[PDB]
C-alpha cells in the first residue's frame, strides 16, 4: 500500500516494515498530526484506507493490548490451539464432564429442582482470566506485544509507530522488522532522525541503505 | 407463633402455619394490603419473642406469574450455596481441585505455546458453577407457580413470612388444600390475604369494625 | 377492538372500559394465564394486537410508572405545557439567560479557557427530578396513575387489569371507568366475580346491567 | 526544589522549573522512561522537604495529541470549582438562589396543572453548570497542544510534576523557548525527558555510566 500527500513527488510505498524519516521538525510535526487526525490532507491507499483500518501508536507503554475485542480474539485463538490436539482436547472434555458430574450431583442434592447447560473450553479460558501481561514490560517487549495483537485485528490494515526508534536498540529494531515480515504485517515507523542503518526513506526525498 | 398487629386491631391476629385472613370490607382489605406494600409503619409483624419481622424477611406476592424464581438475587444465593456444599465434602473438594489444576495446566500450556506473553489468575468453583449455567427449573398454571413460589420461600431461610394477596380467586378448593398441605409438611408460615371467604377451610374473618372471628374450625 | 378464544361463541367487543367476569375459578385462572403469556390461544384484534401493544397489570402498587420511557414522555409533556404560555415561557428564557450569564462570568473568571452551550427548559425539568409520586399511594390512586401514564404510551393499545375490582369501592370503579372514557382509552378488567352493578360480561356468556 | 533519584545515579538530578534531561544512551533513556511509567519502585521523585511525590501527583505525557483536556476527571474538578466560586460570592449565590426558586415554582406550577400526582427534588448549581455544558476550549498543532497541557497542568493543583517524554522531536527551537517561558511565568515544574540534546538550551546530560553534566549554562 501507499502514503501520499501533496508535497511528495511520488507516493511512498508501504511494503512490510517501512521506516520513514522526517528530518525537518516542522514536517515531522505536521505529518504526525495528519496521521493522528486522519479521516484529510494525507492519503493511504488503490482503494483508500479507511480511518478505522489504521492503528496509531504514540504511547507504547500506555497502549491497551488487553481490550475486550483483543481478549476475545486471543481466547478464541487458544481454543483453536486445542483443535489441533484431539487427544488432549478429548481429555479436557473428560475432565470437564467429571467436574460437571460432581456439580450436577450437588444440584440433585440441593433441595431446589435445578437445571444446567454445559461448561465449555472457552468458558474455562475466560474464567482463568487470560490476558497479555504488560505490568513489567520494557518498551521493546511492549512493541512486540502490540505487533502480536495487531495480527489478530483482521480489520486493521496499517499500524503506525510514532517516534519510537528513540527507545529501541539496533538489535531491537532488527527484531521488530523481522517479526513484521514473518507475520506479513504492514507497519510504518515515523521517525524524526535516521534510525541506525536500516533501509529507510528520508524527506529533507531519498532512500538510504537499500 | 407469629403475630400481625396494628392500631385498629382489637387483638393481634396470630399467624401459625398457613393462615387465611378474610378482610370482608373492601376498605379494610385495601387498607391492609396497601399497608403490607408500605411495610417498613402502621402495621406490625413480629415473632413469638416479640422480635419484629423486617421488610427483608417478608416476601410479598400479588403477581404470581411475574414472580421471578431465577432472579439474580436468588441465583447468587444458590451458586454460593452449591459452592458451600463442596466446602463440606473435603474429599469431593479435593477432587475438584485436582481436576481444575489439571485443566489449568493444560490451558496454560497453550498460553506458553502462544506468541504472546500471557498471564492469568485461577478458575474457581463459583466460576465453574456459573459457567455450567445452574438455575431453578421452570410450571404452566398459577396453582403450579404458587407451589414453586412456596418451594423458593422455603429455600430462602432469611425470608420468614410469605404473604399471598388476593390469590384465592385463582385456586380451586383442592388446590388451596394442596397448598396448605405443602405448607404443613414443610413448616412454612404463609398469610393468604383474601377479600372474601375461601371455600370452607378454617380461617379468620375480620369485619368492618376490626372485630375478629374464626370460621370452620 | 376484540377478545376471542375458541370456547367463546362470539368475540367479546372491547370498547372503552370493559368489565369481563369469569365466574369459574378454572377459567379465570386459564384466561389470566393466556393474557400473561400472550404472543397463543387467546386473540385480541381486524389486525391482531401485537404483544408489545398490551400492558398487563396484576400487582398495582408494584407496577413502575416511573420508567425512563414514561418520565421522558412526562417531561416532554411539561415542556409542551409552556408552549401554550408564551408570556411565562419567555420569562423563564429570561431567567435562564440571567443564570447563564452569571455562570458564564464565573467561566471567564476561571483561569481556564472555558466554553459552553445553553441551558434548556427540558434540562431544568430533568434536573428538578420530576416523577410520579407513588410512595403513599392507595390502590385506587395508583390505578389512576397507571391509566394516566398509559395514555402517554401511544404504542400501547390495550391495558388489562387483573383481579383488581376486589380493591376498589363502587365509587372508585365508577371514577376509573369515567376517566377511561374521558381519555379515550381501551381497558379490560378481568374479574373472578361480578363487580358491583356496572355493565359487564359474564362467562359461566351473558351481559348484565346494560 | 524537586529531586529525581534512583539506584544507579551518582547524585540526585534537581528538578527546578523547566528541566531538560538528556539521557544519551538508548538503554538509559528507555530504562528511565519505562521506570516513569512504572512509578509507584526503582526511581524516586521527592520535593525539598524530602516528601515523596506520589503517582497521583505526577502527570506523565508521551501522546500529546491524545491527552484529553476534557476528561471526566477534569470536568468534574472544573464544575466543582465553578460551584465553589459561587459559594464565595454570597451576593451572587443569593441571586442564583432567587432565580432557581422562581424557575422551580414556574415548573412545579405546570406539575400541579398536570393530571399526574408529580413530585420532584431541587435544581442545584452543579446541575445548572453541567446542563450548560461547560468544558475546556479546544489547537491545531502539537506545540499548541503542549501549551494547553501546561495550562491544564497548572490548573490541577494536586499535580505537582509534569513529565514530557520524547517531545523535543516535535518542537522548533522557538517553541521550546515559548514552552519554558510559560513554565517560568507560571512557576511550573516540568521534566522534559529527551534521547539527545535539545538545541542549545541549558540542560543536564546523563551518560552511559549515569554521570551527570550540565550544558549551555
Ligand atoms: Ca455454559
Ligand atoms: Ca509482557
Ligand atoms: Ca478466575
Ligand atoms: Ca445544554
Ligand atoms: Ca401518588
Ligand atoms: Ca436535582
Coordinates of N, CA and C in Angstrom, one line a residue, chain A residues 25-26 28-29 32-33 36 58-59 61-62 135-139 162-163 166-169 192-193 196, chain D residues 26-27 29-30 33-34 37-38 62-63 65-66 140-142 165-166 169-172 195-197 199:
Chain A
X25 N 11.9 19.2 11.7 CA 11.0 19.3 12.8 C 9.6 19.7 12.5
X26 N 9.4 20.7 11.6 CA 8.1 21.2 11.3 C 7.3 20.1 10.5
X28 N 7.9 16.8 10.4 CA 7.7 15.6 11.4 C 6.4 15.9 12.1
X29 N 6.3 17.1 12.7 CA 5.2 17.5 13.5 C 3.9 17.5 12.7
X32 N 2.8 13.8 11.6 CA 2.3 13.1 12.8 C 0.9 13.5 13.1
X33 N 0.7 14.8 13.0 CA -0.6 15.4 13.2 C -1.7 14.9 12.2
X36 N -2.6 11.4 13.1 CA -3.4 11.5 14.2 C -4.9 11.8 13.8
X58 N 1.5 6.1 19.7 CA 2.4 7.1 20.2 C 2.9 6.9 21.6
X59 N 2.1 6.4 22.4 CA 2.4 6.0 23.8 C 2.5 4.5 23.9
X61 N 4.0 2.1 26.2 CA 3.6 1.5 27.5 C 2.1 1.8 27.8
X62 N 1.5 2.8 27.3 CA 0.1 3.1 27.6 C -0.9 2.5 26.7
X135 N 2.5 -5.3 32.9 CA 2.9 -4.6 34.0 C 4.5 -4.4 34.0
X136 N 5.2 -5.4 33.6 CA 6.7 -5.4 33.7 C 7.4 -5.0 32.4
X137 N 6.6 -4.7 31.4 CA 7.2 -4.6 30.1 C 8.3 -3.6 30.0
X138 N 9.3 -3.9 29.2 CA 10.2 -2.9 28.7 C 9.5 -2.4 27.5
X139 N 10.0 -1.2 26.9 CA 9.3 -0.7 25.8 C 9.4 -1.6 24.6
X162 N 4.9 6.0 16.2 CA 5.3 7.4 16.1 C 6.5 7.7 17.1
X163 N 7.7 8.0 16.5 CA 8.8 8.5 17.3 C 9.3 7.4 18.3
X166 N 13.7 6.0 19.0 CA 14.5 6.5 20.1 C 14.5 5.6 21.3
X167 N 13.6 4.6 21.4 CA 13.6 3.7 22.6 C 14.2 2.4 22.3
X168 N 14.5 2.1 21.0 CA 15.0 0.8 20.6 C 16.4 0.7 20.3
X169 N 17.1 -0.4 20.7 CA 18.5 -0.6 20.3 C 18.4 -1.1 18.8
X192 N 12.0 11.1 13.5 CA 12.5 12.4 13.3 C 14.0 12.5 12.9
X193 N 14.7 11.4 12.9 CA 16.1 11.3 12.6 C 16.3 9.9 12.0
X196 N 19.4 4.3 12.9 CA 20.5 3.5 12.6 C 20.8 3.4 11.1
Chain D
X26 N 20.6 5.1 24.6 CA 19.3 4.4 24.4 C 18.9 3.6 25.6
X27 N 19.7 2.7 26.1 CA 19.3 1.9 27.2 C 19.0 2.7 28.4
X29 N 17.9 5.9 28.5 CA 16.7 6.6 28.1 C 15.5 5.6 28.3
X30 N 15.5 4.5 27.7 CA 14.4 3.5 27.8 C 14.2 3.1 29.2
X33 N 12.6 6.0 31.1 CA 11.2 6.3 30.6 C 10.3 5.2 31.1
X34 N 10.7 3.9 31.0 CA 10.0 2.8 31.5 C 9.7 2.9 33.0
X37 N 6.8 5.2 33.8 CA 5.6 4.6 33.6 C 5.3 3.6 34.7
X38 N 6.3 3.0 35.3 CA 6.1 2.0 36.3 C 6.2 2.6 37.7
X62 N 3.3 11.2 26.9 CA 4.0 10.8 25.7 C 3.2 11.1 24.5
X63 N 1.9 10.8 24.6 CA 1.0 11.0 23.5 C 0.3 12.4 23.6
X65 N -1.2 14.6 21.4 CA -2.5 14.8 20.7 C -3.5 14.0 21.5
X66 N -3.2 12.9 22.0 CA -4.1 12.0 22.7 C -4.6 12.5 24.1
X140 N -4.4 23.3 16.8 CA -4.2 22.6 15.6 C -2.7 22.3 15.3
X141 N -1.9 22.3 16.4 CA -0.5 21.8 16.3 C -0.1 21.2 17.6
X142 N 0.9 20.3 17.6 CA 1.4 19.7 18.7 C 2.0 20.7 19.7
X165 N 7.7 13.1 27.6 CA 8.6 12.1 27.1 C 8.8 12.2 25.6
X166 N 10.0 12.5 25.2 CA 10.4 12.4 23.8 C 9.7 13.4 22.9
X169 N 11.3 16.2 19.8 CA 11.4 15.9 18.4 C 10.3 16.6 17.6
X170 N 9.3 17.1 18.3 CA 8.2 17.8 17.7 C 8.3 19.3 17.7
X171 N 9.2 19.9 18.5 CA 9.2 21.3 18.7 C 10.4 22.1 18.1
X172 N 10.1 23.2 17.4 CA 11.2 24.1 17.0 C 11.8 24.7 18.2
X195 N 16.1 12.0 24.3 CA 17.1 11.0 23.9 C 18.4 11.6 23.3
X196 N 18.4 13.0 23.2 CA 19.5 13.6 22.6 C 19.4 15.1 23.0
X197 N 20.4 15.9 22.7 CA 20.4 17.3 23.1 C 19.3 18.1 22.4
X199 N 18.4 21.4 21.1 CA 19.0 22.7 20.6 C 20.2 23.1 21.6

